[PDB]
RNA sequence: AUCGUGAUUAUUGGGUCUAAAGGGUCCGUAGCCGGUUUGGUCAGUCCUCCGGGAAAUCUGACAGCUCAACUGUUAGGCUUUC
RNA sequence: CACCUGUGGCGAAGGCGUCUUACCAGAACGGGUUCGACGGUGAGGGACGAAAGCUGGGGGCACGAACCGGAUUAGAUACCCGGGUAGUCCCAGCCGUAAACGAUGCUCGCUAGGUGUCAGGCAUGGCGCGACCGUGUCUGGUGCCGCAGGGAAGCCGUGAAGCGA
């Protein structure tokens, strides 16, 4: 594998080992073959195989919009989807796109009933809205599980979040918007302004 | 002022545009009767000195300089030769900083824009990659996705040559680079 | 805010400055201004332009700042006030003139609506004043009989 | 600042005939004739009144 | 991680980190404070630019 | 017509925080407005505030130090007892010990943590976090 | 059938430009919502007290039915919102 | 009742274009003017309410449902063309509906900007340095452009479909 950008040269030199220092570098993480060495423990799951099509003069174009979400079950998770003529190349392109979009989300115990403080649930209440699908990340008591959907359980188990209550608004049929709104909520987890004394 | 205000009056630097913006009020000191609003020349030299202090913290071969106008084209090339900075005078490819497989690929650390409104694509590309940019606005410019503002007339040939020579000499003195270029080199061929 | 019956908001306010004291550049006294107010009232001049003529030809910045009393306070103190407020009298006077005009132009429906709006303002003023005991509880605004210029 | 100020200002007009030390408001809505003898100090314009005699000094 | 114009966290993609143009101390800016030109004030040297 | 000045002030603070403006003016100041601003200042969410009188109800020159996320009035001002704060906290607030509810009480106006310490309740006034 | 699903009755907690949906406009009662401010009261409200709010069913444990449900004691709940 | 005429104006909306006069009303603008919360919205209820239609009296140039005739076409009970009644107009009432639309109810505070033009006010340069016209600026309307914001998007965007009451 030939690194191409400055981040690839830095990771091949050994200066950047984990993705946190790469994000601290501030450069664009464009090569899919950098995060695999930075995080060899990356895991992902295909979230749907919804087969799109398209109209032509003679026949009908066919593609696959398979989406795969990537996390590490510790506090890092990312979103990524891709399409191509075959399910294999489509899912592999989605895996390439997802690993470039991994982010670090800080976690704790902000539940009204839970009082542990050790990171097992969302730090506080946040929202994720991709399309009309919206998800609120209300904290949950420890040792309880995710009070969300099956794809929500997959995405939040990839992201490392353990116990959460949620709620869904709008047309929840689109699994792609469900994954993207969960991503938006997790990104709003670590963007709200916290007190300096906390 | 490091250079006398009479020189800025003569060189056309203080001439702006008949219409100004509300965010450019802080760099304007007085409305002229003609319509063209004169900028703050002391503020212009202050911004130039602050940018040269900021540009002196980095090597010239990591800086990026872009320009679009013909009148800003020659002094941009003079800046690129006198510093070694990779300039993009003339037409600009939209995917130079991004698009690693494209010709003209670059991974800078600071961006310089000769005119922020005209060089909008470079501003969007720098904002996408996340590179702070020292810009060169005018009386009818907005500083969106701009880190540092240089209030000078970018539509005057003499003003552009004088401002580019001032920035070049200021940076080259701050970073102890040998600067043997003179303003006639940066002056546009008349 | 919007007006009472037209929603055309406006900001042509009279900007009175923050003055907690009487004038320091004027030699006018409280007795002089109260005498001027009483004489102008006996001439037949309403309180809206009494202060205006005080502030224009005598340059009096405000009667309350110097005398400590507004125009109507001086009017009540000297027994030189009307039995009905000037705003209610003005609205009733305009309504009577508008009704006199509308009794010969029965096609003038726009001014019929204008009369209705002024009637709404008149009932609003009467409701406020009966709330604050300025006018009697049993004296309702009769638009045909008990609406004359001096009501008794 | 945060407080509002009276952009319209007073004057110190001096009477052209009786030399009265009268005071007039600048944005006069009425013909401010002289208090004492015979004069009209300024006429009521919709904006700023047009003064006919000397202004000794514009006040606040 | 804390902007000098808003103080919000630079967890999103597109945060620019740069030293001061007057003293060299690090000053941060977000997309909203950079798209909208929010004035940033350096807490050490007091430098204020648009 | 102006008929909710505390909610207007908190909406202005919300707008100023959303734009990230360090300072903003507060439309006509009130005593409960000053009490809410003082309790919010003691919570550390709001920096500074001064009553600059203008021959009117009075206004504020509030220096927002960038510590809040959203703050509006509580309408209706619900009656609350010492054993009735946690449901309002679970409704408005995002997390335990995160953000406070401005409460008005006969002892004084204060966040519901200090009200629970006082063991006296009353009417909810607002919420800030 | 009915509850939940369904924030598909939505005070919490929905919408109403183009998807069902702003009344043609407007005036306007009951209702409802209401400026800053000194002075007085304390009715809603607030903390507290005292008379109540039958047991039963509810929750937990103890005790005893072999575990169990279940019966008794007991600490809570409801009884509500006088 | 043309051109004049406008991505102008006034009006609660419907709506209003020859001119003169009388009557009336609102607005914005200026205001160290009078008043002191007198305010917003508002189911019921009330008035206004385009055009068509209806009732009674007029008027009828033009236009023009119906109707009659001439073509078109397979047919034409239609488009086309020739006549042309009711009607359009006025006077006195009724009905009370429109895609009565901005498909956006009304009131308030709040929130980057650039950008016409209109009323008023205000500075200044010119103006036969006068009646007048230019640029700047505050306020209130009247349009386009659009960041943030939000929406499913078209989009909206201090004149919200933004954020609260
Ligand atoms: Mg008709
Ligand atoms: Mg409507
Ligand atoms: Zn815990
Ligand atoms: Zn005289």
Curated annotation (Swiss-Prot), chain A:
State if Ribosomal protein is listed as a keyword. Answer: yes
Q: Which PROSITE patterns match?
A: RIBOSOMAL_S5, S5_DSRBD
The record places domain S5 DRBM at 42-105
Pfam families for this protein: Ribosomal_S5, Ribosomal_S5_C
Q: Which Gene3D superfamilies match?
A: 3.30.160.20, 3.30.230.10
What does the entry give for GO biological process?
translation
Where are its TM segments located? none
Its GO CC terms? cytosolic small ribosomal subunit
Q: Which InterPro entries match?
A: Ribosomal_Su5_D2-typ_SF, Ribosomal_uS5, Ribosomal_uS5_arc, Ribosomal_uS5_C, Ribosomal_uS5_euk/arc, Ribosomal_uS5_N, Ribosomal_uS5_N_CS, Ribsml_uS5_D2-typ_fold_subgr
UniProt KW RNA-binding keyword = yes
List keywords of the entry alphabetically: Ribonucleoprotein, Ribosomal protein, RNA-binding, rRNA-binding
Q: Name one GO molecular function term.
A: structural constituent of ribosome
Function in brief: With S4 and S12 plays an important role in translational accuracy.
Q: What is known of its domains?
A: The N-terminal domain interacts with the head of the 30S subunit; the C-terminal domain interacts with the body and contacts protein S4. The interaction surface between S4 and S5 is involved in control of translational fidelity.
The record's family statement is: Belongs to the universal ribosomal protein uS5 family.
Describe the subunit structure. Answer: Part of the 30S ribosomal subunit. Contacts protein S4.
Q: What is this protein called?
A: Small ribosomal subunit protein uS5
Q: Which organism is it from?
A: Methanosarcina acetivorans (strain ATCC 35395 / DSM 2834 / JCM 12185 / C2A)
Swiss-Prot record, chain C:
The transmembrane segments are none
An example of a Gene Ontology cellular component annotation for this protein is: cytosolic small ribosomal subunit
| Statement: the UniProt record of this protein carries the keyword RNA-binding | no
Annotated region Disordered: the residues are 1-23
Which GO-annotated molecular functions does the record name? small ribosomal subunit rRNA binding; structural constituent of ribosome
Question: What is the top-level taxon of the source organism?
Answer: Archaea
Asked if the keyword Ribonucleoprotein belongs to this entry, the reply reads yes
Q: Which Pfam families match?
A: Ribosomal_S13_N, Ribosomal_S15
Task: Tell me the PROSITE patterns matching this sequence.
Answer: RIBOSOMAL_S15 (PS00362)
How is the subunit organization of this protein annotated in UniProt? Part of the 30S ribosomal subunit.
Its protein name is Small ribosomal subunit protein uS15
Q: Which organism is it from?
A: Methanosarcina acetivorans (strain ATCC 35395 / DSM 2834 / JCM 12185 / C2A)
The record lists the lineage as:
Archaea, Methanobacteriati, Methanobacteriota, Stenosarchaea group, Methanomicrobia
Gene name linked to the record: rps15
Swiss-Prot record, chain D:
Q: Where are the zinc fingers (C4-type)?
A: 15-37
Q: Kindly state which keywords UniProt assigns to this record, in alphabetical order.
A: Metal-binding, Ribonucleoprotein, Ribosomal protein, Zinc, Zinc-finger
Please give an example of a GO cellular component term from this record: cytosolic small ribosomal subunit
PROSITE patterns in the record, alphabetically?
RIBOSOMAL_S27E (PS01168)
- Which GO BP terms, alphabetically? ribosomal small subunit assembly; translation
What is one Pfam family matched by this protein?
A: Ribosomal_S27e
List cofactor names only: Zn(2+)
Q: Cite the binding residues for Zn(2+).
A: 15, 18, 34, 37
The record's remark on the cofactor is:
Binds 1 zinc ion per subunit.
In its UniProt record, a GO molecular function of this protein is: RNA binding
Q: Which HAMAP family match?
A: Ribosomal_eS27
- Subunit text: Part of the 30S ribosomal subunit.
Q: Which NCBIfam families match?
A: PRK00415.1
Family per UniProt? Belongs to the eukaryotic ribosomal protein eS27 family.
List the protein's name.
Small ribosomal subunit protein eS27
* Organism from which the protein derives: Methanosarcina acetivorans (strain ATCC 35395 / DSM 2834 / JCM 12185 / C2A)
Primary gene name: rps27e
Swiss-Prot record, chain F:
**RNA-binding recorded as keyword:** yes
- What Gene Ontology cellular component terms go with this record? cytosolic small ribosomal subunit
Q: Kindly indicate whether the keyword Cell membrane belongs to this entry.
A: no
Keywords attached to this entry: Ribonucleoprotein, Ribosomal protein, RNA-binding, rRNA-binding
Annotated GO biological process: translation
Which superkingdom does the taxonomy of this entry point to?
A: Archaea
Q: Name one Pfam family in it.
A: Ribosomal_S8
Q: What does this protein do?
A: One of the primary rRNA binding proteins, it binds directly to 16S rRNA central domain where it helps coordinate assembly of the platform of the 30S subunit.
Per UniProt, subunit arrangement is: Part of the 30S ribosomal subunit.
- List, alphabetically, the PANTHER family matched: 40S RIBOSOMAL PROTEIN S15A
Q: Would you identify the family this protein belongs to, as annotated?
A: Belongs to the universal ribosomal protein uS8 family.
From the Swiss-Prot or TrEMBL record, give the protein name.
Answer: Small ribosomal subunit protein uS8
Source organism of the structure: Methanosarcina acetivorans (strain ATCC 35395 / DSM 2834 / JCM 12185 / C2A)
């Amino acid at each position: 594998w030939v690194p191409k950008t400055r981040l690839g040269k830095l990771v091949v030199e050994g200066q950047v080992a984990s993705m946190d220092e790469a994000i601290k570098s501030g450069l664009p993480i464009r090569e899919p073959q950098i995060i695999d060495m930075l995080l060899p423990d990356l895991e992902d799951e295909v979230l749907d195989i919804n087969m799109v099509q398209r109209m032509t003069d003679s026949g009908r174009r066919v593609k696959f919009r398979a989406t795969v979400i990537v996390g590490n079950r510790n506090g890092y998770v990312g979103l990524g989807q891709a399409k191509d003529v075959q399910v294999g190349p489509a899912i592999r392109k989605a895996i390439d796109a997802a690993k470039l979009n991994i982010t670090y989300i800080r976690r704790g115990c902000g539940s009204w009933e839970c009082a542990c403080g050790l990171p097992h649930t969302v730090p506080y209440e946040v929202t994720g809205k991709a399309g009309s699908v919206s998800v609120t990340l209300i904290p949950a008591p420890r040792g309880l599980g995710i009070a969300a959907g099956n794809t929500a359980t997959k995405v939040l188990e990839k992201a490392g979040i353990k116990d959460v209550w949620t709620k869904t608004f709008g047309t929840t049929r689109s699994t792609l918007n469900f994954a993207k709104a969960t991503y938006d909520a997790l990104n709003q987890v670590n963007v709200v302004r916290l007190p300096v004394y906390y | 002022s490091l250079v006398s205000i009479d020189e800025y009056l003569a060189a056309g630097v203080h001439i702006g545009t008949q219409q100004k913006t509300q965010d450019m009020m802080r760099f304007v000191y007085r409305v002229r009767t003609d319509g063209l609003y004169v900028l703050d020349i002391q503020s212009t030299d202050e911004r130039i000195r602050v940018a040269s202090k900021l540009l002196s913290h980095y090597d010239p071969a990591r800086i990026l300089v872009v320009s679009s106008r013909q009148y800003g084209q020659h002094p941009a090339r003079m800046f690129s030769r006198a510093l070694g900075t990779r300039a993009m005078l003339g037409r600009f490819i939209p995917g130079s900083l991004t698009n690693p497989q494209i010709h003209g690929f670059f991974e800078p650390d600071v961006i310089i824009v000769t005119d922020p409104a005209g060089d909008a694509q470079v501003l969007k590309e720098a904002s996408s990659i996340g590179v702070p940019v020292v810009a060169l606005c005018d009386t009818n410019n907005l500083t969106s996705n701009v880190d540092l503002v240089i209030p000078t007339n970018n539509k005057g040939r003499k003003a552009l040559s004088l401002v580019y020579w001032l920035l070049a000499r200021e940076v080259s003195r701050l970073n102890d680079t040998p600067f043997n270029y003179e303003l006639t080199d940066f002056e546009t061929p008349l | 805010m919007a007006k009472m019956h037209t929603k055309r908001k406006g900001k042509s306010s009279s900007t009175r400055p923050i003055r907690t004291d009487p004038p320091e550049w004027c030699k006018i006294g409280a007795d002089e201004v109260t005498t001027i107010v009483l004489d102008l009232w006996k001439q037949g001049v309403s309180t809206a332009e009494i202060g205006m003529v005080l502030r224009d030809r005598y340059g009096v910045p405000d009667a309350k700042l110097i005398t400590g009393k507004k125009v109507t306070t001086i009017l009540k103190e000297n027994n030189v006030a009307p039995n009905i407020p000037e705003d209610l009298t003005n609205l009733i006077v305009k309504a009577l003139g508008l009704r006199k005009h509308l009794s010969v132009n029965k096609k003038d429906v726009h001014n019929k609506r204008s009369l209705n709006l002024t009637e709404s303002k008149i009932r609003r003023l009467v409701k406020y004043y009966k709330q604050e005991k300025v006018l009697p509880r049993d004296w309702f605004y009769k638009p045909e009989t008990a609406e004359m210029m001096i009501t008794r | 600042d945060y407080t509002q100020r009276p952009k319209s200002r007073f004057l110190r007009v001096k009477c052209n005939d009786c030399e009265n030390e009268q005071i007039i408001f600048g944005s006069a809505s009425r013909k401010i004739t002289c208090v004492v003898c015979g004069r009209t100090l300024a006429e009521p314009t919709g904006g700023k009144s047009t003064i006919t005699t000397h202004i000794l000094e514009v006040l606040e | 991680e804390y902007c000098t114009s808003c103080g919000i966290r630079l967890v999103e993609k597109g945060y620019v980190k740069f030293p001061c143009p007057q003293c060299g101390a690090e000053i941060g800016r977000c997309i909203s404070c950079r798209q909208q030109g929010n004035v940033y004030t350096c807490p050490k040297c007091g430098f204020k630019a648009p | 017509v102006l008929l909710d000045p505390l909610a207007n002030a908190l909406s202005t603070i919300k707008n100023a925080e959303a734009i990230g403006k360090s300072s903003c003016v507060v439309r006509p100041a009130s005593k409960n407005i000053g009490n809410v601003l003082k309790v919010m200042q003691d919570l550390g969410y709001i920096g500074d505030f001064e009553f600059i009188d203008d021959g009117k109800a009075g206004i504020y020159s509030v220096t927002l130090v960038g510590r809040i996320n959203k703050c509006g009035a509580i309408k209706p001002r619900y009656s609350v007892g010492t054993a009735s704060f946690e449901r309002w906290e679970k409704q408005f607030l995002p997390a335990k010990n995160f953000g406070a509810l401005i409460v008005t009480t006969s002892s004084g106006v204060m966040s519901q943590y200090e009200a629970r310490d006082k063991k006296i309740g009353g009417q909810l006034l607002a919420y800030v976090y």
